[PDB]
Design a protein around this nucleic acid. Structure first.
Length: 58
RNA sequence: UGAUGGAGGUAGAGCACUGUUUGGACUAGGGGCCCAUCGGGUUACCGAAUUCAGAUAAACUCCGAAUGCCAUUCAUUUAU
């Protein structure tokens, strides 16, 4: 259905795939929160930022 | 980012060829004498006529890949 999401790391020192996928979601500051519905593009967005981002399923 | 279709010989085991290669069988027949002045060239090297196994590459390979790239009146998010 819907997901929550949150940064817990920094964007610094990371390649330009991961910066682009972060800005594509709308994640600017650390510990910001964005809620978005579960598509099958968004699960692919998260399967490349899995280590920077934590996911709650609300 | 997800889905779909395709372009192309990189990572090497691999006796498809090109060169490099180690053992065994085998003979087409030859090693100064043949053994001899017609039958076994003989112990032995035996390749190519053959063939049983094993090695190997950057300029050797019918065939790949990890989405890397190019494309789509396609999908979701974002702002170029």
């Amino acid at each position: 259905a819907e997901l929550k999401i949150t940064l817990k790391r920094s964007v610094i020192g990371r390649p330009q795939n991961q910066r682009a996928t972060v800005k594509a979601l709308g994640l600017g500051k650390v510990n910001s929160t964005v809620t978005k519905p579960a598509n099958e593009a968004i699960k692919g967005m998260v399967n490349t930022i899995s280590h920077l981002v934590d996911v709650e399923e609300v």
